[PDB]
Amino acid sequence: TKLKCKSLRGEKKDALQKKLDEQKTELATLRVSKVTGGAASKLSKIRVVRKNIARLLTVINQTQKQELRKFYADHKYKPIDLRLKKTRAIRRRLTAHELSLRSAKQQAKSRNQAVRKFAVKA
Amino acid sequence: APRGNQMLGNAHFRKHWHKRIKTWFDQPARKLRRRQNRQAKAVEIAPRPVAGLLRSVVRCPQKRYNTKTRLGRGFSLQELKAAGISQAQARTIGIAVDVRRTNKTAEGLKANADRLKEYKAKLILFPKKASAPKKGDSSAEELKVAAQLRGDVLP
Amino acid sequence: TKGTQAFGKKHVKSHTLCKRCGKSSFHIQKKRCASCGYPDAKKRTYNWGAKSIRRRTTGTGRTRHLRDVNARFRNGFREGTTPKPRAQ
Amino acid sequence: MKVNPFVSSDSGKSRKAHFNAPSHERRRIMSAPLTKELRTKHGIRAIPIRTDDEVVVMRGRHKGNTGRVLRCYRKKFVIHIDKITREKANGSTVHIGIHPSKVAITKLKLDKDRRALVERKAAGRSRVTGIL
Amino acid sequence: SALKKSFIKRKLAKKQKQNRPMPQWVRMKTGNTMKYNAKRRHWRRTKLKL
RNA sequence: AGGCUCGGCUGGAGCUUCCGUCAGUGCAGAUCGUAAUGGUAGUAGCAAAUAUUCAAGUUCGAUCCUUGAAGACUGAAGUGGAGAAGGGUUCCACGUGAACAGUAGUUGGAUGUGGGUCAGUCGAUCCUAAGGUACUGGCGAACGCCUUGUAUCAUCGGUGGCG
RNA sequence: ACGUUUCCGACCCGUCUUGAAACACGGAUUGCGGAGUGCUUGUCUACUGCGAGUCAAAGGGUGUUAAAACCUUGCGGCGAA
RNA sequence: UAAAUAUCGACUCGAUUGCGAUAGCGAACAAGUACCGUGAGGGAAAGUUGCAAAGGACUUUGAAGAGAGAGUUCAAGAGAACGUGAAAUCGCUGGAGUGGAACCGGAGACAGUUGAU
RNA sequence: CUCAACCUGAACUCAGUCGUGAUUACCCGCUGAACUUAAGCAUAUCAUUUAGCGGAGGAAAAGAAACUAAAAAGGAUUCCCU
RNA sequence: UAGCUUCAGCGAUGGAUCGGUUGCAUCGAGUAUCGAUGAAGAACGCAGCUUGCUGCGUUACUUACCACGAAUUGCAGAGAGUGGUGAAAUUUCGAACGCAUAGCACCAACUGGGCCUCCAGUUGGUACGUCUGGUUCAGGGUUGUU
């Protein structure tokens, strides 16, 4: 019946592949039943099997992506699919440190000129 | 076909004016928005005056108006020197500096010098670091009566 | 003779289906779509065709990615994080 | 009169929200009052009705009939009560839909989550009634 | 034409699938208003201007 | 007078006096817009392409569907047998009540449900024709255009040895 | 009283036109829709307030039955040559 | 080189002396849809049973449509194209007129209607 | 003639970047009519406007005087009233 | 008599009018977020039964996670299902990218065909313009050196 991704998370790659193959075989059997005048109870399991295949693939892909993200966490150049997907304009924006950069003249002006806190008596 | 005694028509409506129409249904909305902007600015820069920099006194240019004075853009460097205020210091303590205006008459220079003097008298300067005051900074109980000023500074 | 007799000879299509817009407006001999301008890089729109612009503008399709971006903007385009690990 | 500038007193907007509410909102909409005794016993005034609750019809042609909530047809905004049925022409029996606002709950189907919900509602009622 | 293209065959297949009577159980759904398929096409009356 | 009040019948959820004020405020016409309906009228008409008849079957029901017998026609530059463009399931089987088949219908290119298109050798795929369209190069405020040419032009690839 | 019957009168409406019942045009019938409006600028008239003044603009201040109402103008419009 | 400024095209909201299905956006609905044109493009009509389908079991004539009974229902003359249900047009029953128009105004009569402390 | 510089110009599926194409209400640069009014019409008007092309943002553009002016002078840009 | 006209009563045809209204119009407010990490748009496909509309993309009327807490509903059927949404995934055309534009072709690796020069499969890659740097170069263009 309905698998639990909580439980599947602990399994290993080979185990997940095996379970995916079992689910696919069961789906093929149910598809045969569909054409060969299958019972309504039998046909009602197709949706569950399909969503179970979806769950297994979800877990597999999530674990693979986590491993790859960890692997490339420190490389200067990362694969395109492992980079931040903000908007294109946001990606073209300057970095925070580049924005914070100030020239020597601006630093000197910051040192010398600094607004004070004051009030005016009415 | 005008008939009888009439004033000759003058209405400038021969262009496709229906493509350029401006209504004023958002006048109260704009009023509210500007009040809210002033409130936000006051919260941001408290206790400094909401109006902002202090402006100078100015004679209206032409002889039709020269008997009236009004707020100018800022204080000329001659006036700042006469009041003994550096331009750099004025920018910090919130006084507008008009780098284009120059004084050619003692009375005009003196009016603005006096204005600067009274502003300095009314000024309250907070210590740069609250823990440690310095020379020039206002006194402790003076810093308690500090309140945000609304409207023009020295109207 | 112009009319019934002449219409019997109409059996060669001037336009076929366009790859970009799917309309039957791709001129075979001119090799250009009379509707979207394919294969020009840019799209064919004219301000005198207001109804045509309305028919083929944004929002008349699925706007899948635009809706996705709108959904993700509401939370500041946060990435790399997950909800607080909890349970039922 | 409402004061919240983000709450709409538009009849059309209210009707649209009511008739297009999703299932979790229809749950809240389909709430029923507790009887007097149940109200004093549990501390709450009303709760979102649930299947396997016991109710008594308070108004309509079936006023006074009791039973158990067989189903909560959230799509139709009605509940089907046990023993509240009519007969079609052929002879089959069909449950008569009743709006939950016209019945009163006489026994709450309590579980972990329903108990927690009742505890929250009772705590809030006590808190507000103390201030009032 | 007998000698056709795969894309044309694909479009014709979709049109064939769409030309179908409405399922009978749809009339029993809650709030349903459709009584039949109003987009049926007859090969001789209306032509797919492909 | 514009119109108004009441009664009776139908109907099932709103309506109203008076005071101010406002208006998308009154129809017989505009070869007015739109929707519906008359007399004409059971009328004009359903007349090109020679032609049908007998017995039976099925059916509630047969000029028209099916079988057999007869009589005719196209008459091989066919009313025969197959294809290209075009159509797109109209192909085939089994049901069919309504609509459609300008009479009818048990029949149908109609309608409901299913089935059906099998390639190393048939085509596409491959070559180029008329011609189209790129490159650069020029022009152009610009989208982009013009030339397919020594205009442009540093446009490679073949044998052999070595490896 | 839109029934019948008598006696008297009685040409089909709208329109353009000197002149229409016209052998002038529109009108087979019924329902519903259908045409001097908005705004700017003038001028006169009527009413209201104040009156050598009057109206105040943008704006500002306040207002939560907060697009309203209320307060607010060395200055501006028209008038006073 | 910010602010004051423009703008609802996009996303999210609040309102109204606006329209109330021939109105209001073309579109209240499987509407930029059906459909039309080779193409650029053009472009509709279409809201309403009932509180609840309780959507008419069963008998009966018919091949069937359908009808006669019955049942449900506040009610079905609310019966599916279903709230109301106008005019034009049309059918039946009864009365009355009826010689190449019919209608109409005025004045009676008849029929008829209505009032009488 | 050998080697080595520079200058100029190439080829690379060389390492790593960036542009293209949509949207229309507002914004910036161009190109650019005629109907219409003048009771005709050609300058004029419509209009430095429909239509066409290009380029951005949340605003854009402008912006810190080769300014206004002629006072006892004002003092970047943008916007409102006049 | 019949027909015709007319009146009263009854019934058809037709869909006006009335009664609201999840629609429209206008005004105001708050935000700034498309695309080679492949947009807008198009095509095809996806459900047990589901043509259309809506939703989605081969994990295809949706997966994971988080909140709430018992349904969905036409028939079936069996922490539900709704909402949020940060993880994963996101077909083919399309600026659309190997070349062409509804077709055919090149480079590598790996796998199978028994071996393979030959087949087949899978995976990665091969667009134009441009910047920075790298490598390999060309020119008596200027210069030095032998």
Swiss-Prot record, chain A:
PANTHER family: 60S RIBOSOMAL PROTEIN L35 (PTHR45722), LARGE RIBOSOMAL SUBUNIT PROTEIN UL29-RELATED (PTHR45722:SF2). GO terms for cellular component: cytosolic large ribosomal subunit. Belongs to the universal ribosomal protein uL29 family. This is Large ribosomal subunit protein uL29. One of its GO terms (biological process) is maturation of LSU-rRNA from tricistronic rRNA transcript (SSU-rRNA, 5.8S rRNA, LSU-rRNA). Pfam families: Ribosomal_L29. Keywords: Ribonucleoprotein, Ribosomal protein. It comes from Caenorhabditis elegans. The keyword Ribonucleoprotein applies. GO terms for molecular function: mRNA binding; structural constituent of ribosome. PROSITE patterns: RIBOSOMAL_L29 (PS00579). The keyword Ribosomal protein applies. InterPro entries: Ribosomal_uL29, Ribosomal_uL29_CS, Ribosomal_uL29_euk, Ribosomal_uL29_sf.
Swiss-Prot record, chain B:
Keywords: Cytoplasm, Ribonucleoprotein, Ribosomal protein. It is found in: Cytoplasm. GO terms for molecular function: RNA binding; structural constituent of ribosome. GO terms for cellular component: cytosol; cytosolic large ribosomal subunit. Disulfide bonds: none annotated. It comes from the Eukaryota. Its main location: cytoplasm. Component of the 60S large ribosomal subunit (LSU). Belongs to the eukaryotic ribosomal protein eL13 family. Component of the ribosome, a large ribonucleoprotein complex responsible for the synthesis of proteins in the cell. The small ribosomal subunit (SSU) binds messenger RNAs (mRNAs) and translates the encoded message by selecting cognate aminoacyl-transfer RNA (tRNA) molecules. The large subunit (LSU) contains the ribosomal catalytic site termed the peptidyl transferase center (PTC), which catalyzes the formation of peptide bonds, thereby polymerizing the amino acids delivered by tRNAs into a polypeptide chain. This is Large ribosomal subunit protein eL13. It comes from Caenorhabditis elegans. The chain holds residues 2 to 156 of 207 of the full protein.
Curated annotation (Swiss-Prot), chain D:
Residues 1-24 are annotated as: Disordered. InterPro entries: KOW, Rib_uL2_dom2, Ribosomal_uL24_CS, Ribosomal_uL24_euk/arc, Ribosomal_uL24_KOW, Translation_prot_SH3-like_sf. Residues 1-11 have a biased composition (Polar residues). One of its GO terms (cellular component) is cytosolic large ribosomal subunit. One of its GO terms (molecular function) is structural constituent of ribosome. CDD domains: KOW_RPL26 (cd06089). Coiled coil: none annotated. Pfam families: KOW (PF00467), Ribosomal_L26 (PF16906). GO terms for biological process: cytoplasmic translation; ribosomal large subunit biogenesis. It comes from the Eukaryota. Gene3D superfamilies: 2.30.30.30. The keyword Glycosyltransferase does not apply. Keywords: Ribonucleoprotein, Ribosomal protein. Belongs to the universal ribosomal protein uL24 family. This is Large ribosomal subunit protein uL24. It comes from Caenorhabditis elegans. The gene is rpl-26.
UniProtKB/Swiss-Prot annotation, chain E:
InterPro entries: Ribosomal_eL39, Ribosomal_eL39_CS, Ribosomal_eL39_dom_sf. Residues 6-18 have a biased composition (Basic residues). Keywords: Ribonucleoprotein, Ribosomal protein. The gene is rpl-39. GO terms for biological process: translation. Coiled coil: none annotated. SUPFAM superfamilies: Ribosomal protein L39e. GO terms for cellular component: cytosolic large ribosomal subunit. Residues 1-22 are annotated as: Disordered. Belongs to the eukaryotic ribosomal protein eL39 family. It comes from Caenorhabditis elegans. This is Large ribosomal subunit protein eL39. Interacts with impact. One of its GO terms (molecular function) is structural constituent of ribosome.
